[PDB]
Paper text:
The pseudo-Nt-Ser residue remains coordinated to the metal centre in a bidentate arrangement, supported by interactions with [name]-F101, -D206 and -Y212, with one water molecule trans to [name]-H112, analogous to [name]-L8K-Ser. No additional interactions are observed except, possibly, weak water-mediated hydrogen bonds between the second amide of [name] and the sidechain hydroxyls of [name]-Y212 and -Y222, as these water molecules are absent in the [name]-L8K-Ser structure. The crystal structures of cobalt-incorporated [name] in complex with [name]-L8K-Ser and [name] provide valuable information on substrate analogue binding. To corroborate that the crystal structures of cobalt-incorporated [name] in complex with [name]-L8K-Ser and [name] are biologically relevant, molecular dynamic (MD) simulations were conducted with different combinations of active site metal and pseudo-N-terminal substrate residues over 100 ns. In each instance, no changes in hydrogen bonding distance were observed, with Ser and Cys interacting with cobalt(II) and iron(II) through ligation of both their amine and hydroxyl/thiol groups, supporting bidentate coordination of the substrate. MD was also used to calculate the binding energies associated with [name]/Cys complex formation, verifying key residue interactions, most notably the contributions of [name]-Y87 and [name]-W7, [name]-W257 and [name]-C14, [name]-Y212 and [name]/Cys, all of which were highlighted above during assessment of the crystal structure. It also emphasised the role of [name]-Q252, which forms hydrogen bonds with the backbone nitrogen and oxygen of [name]-R12.
They regulate the O2-dependent stability of proteins bearing an N-terminal cysteine residue through the N-degron pathway. In animals, the Cys branch of the N-degron pathway is regulated by the NCO [name] ([name]), which also plays a role in cysteamine catabolism and taurine biosynthesis.
Author numbering:
A (entry chain B): 1 to 14
B (entry chain A): 5 to 22, 41 to 137, 145 to 229, 240 to 270
């Protein structure tokens, strides 16, 4: 899934 | 009577990042660097992690992140790299960054985009597809060195060393990272990944191709065990 993180931007967290 | 070192780092980061233009910035950045130079893994209650010598199963991430604090001005946390892993080459658009190795050894490769067309006869290995040949852009490889907890902090800025790749060398490694401002995809500040291309001494010109986040790279959060940063 994609999460908008402040620590690596748009991140595919999987 | 004395706040924890990580509290003091967060306070100084807030003062420092509220760009080059502001006055007092260089002095505040120097003070922040001196605080980071003093930081050790034990100050964050993080024990150094050593290799398992076992393969990494497909369901676990190669890298994890411990969140410490974030404001609109900066983000503060720890990235923890397992043995044999890398954070692929990426940029930090319009951002400053500061990194301090906590344990282990990392190889940091530092690069910048040069702001040109690929010459028609140029070839790479592996060969590029047509859409990739259209998209490649010139860059400069500025440095490629190994860093440990004794190296002191590494800095990047919007226009220098803004692209970096971070490899865990001979086992797990971890580093504290400060980004300022943090990423903000909805504000148009996102993280872009790149490949450096080998055609067929530093600084030297290279070719850069923007690429999706690698299939075998992602990062998951894990609990931060150290002293807490309080408003
Ligand atoms: Cl206090
Ligand atoms: Cl090619
Ligand atoms: Co980075």
């Amino acid at each position: 899934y994609i999460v908008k993180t402040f620590w690596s931007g748009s991140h595919r967290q999987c | 009577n004395m706040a924890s070192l990580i509290q003091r780092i967060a306070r100084q980061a807030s003062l420092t990042f509220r760009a080059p233009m502001q006055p007092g910035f260089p002095e505040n950045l120097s003070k922040l660097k001196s605080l980071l130079t003093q930081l050790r893994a034990e100050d964050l209650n993080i024990a150094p992690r050593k290799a398992t010598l076992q393969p990494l199963p497909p369901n676990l991430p190669p890298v994890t992140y411990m969140h410490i604090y974030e404001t609109d001005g900066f983000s503060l946390g720890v990235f923890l790299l397992k043995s044999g892993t890398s954070i692929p080459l990426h940029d930090h658009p319009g951002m400053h960054g500061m990194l301090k190795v906590l344990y282990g050894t990392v190889r940091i490769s530092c690069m910048d985009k040069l702001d040109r067309a690929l010459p028609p006869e140029q070839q790479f290995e592996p060969p590029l597809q047509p859409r990739e040949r259209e998209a490649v852009r010139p860059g400069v490889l500025r440095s490629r060195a190994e860093y440990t907890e004794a190296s002191g902090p590494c800095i990047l800025t919007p226009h220098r060393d803004n692209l970096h790749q971070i490899d865990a060398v001979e086992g797990p490694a971890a580093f504290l990272d400060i980004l300022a401002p943090p990423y903000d995809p909805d504000d148009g500040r996102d993280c872009h990944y790149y490949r450096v291309l080998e055609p067929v001494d530093l600084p030297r010109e290279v070719w850069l191709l923007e690429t999706p986040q690698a299939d075998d790279f992602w990062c998951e959060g894990e609990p931060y065990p150290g002293p807490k940063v309080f408003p």
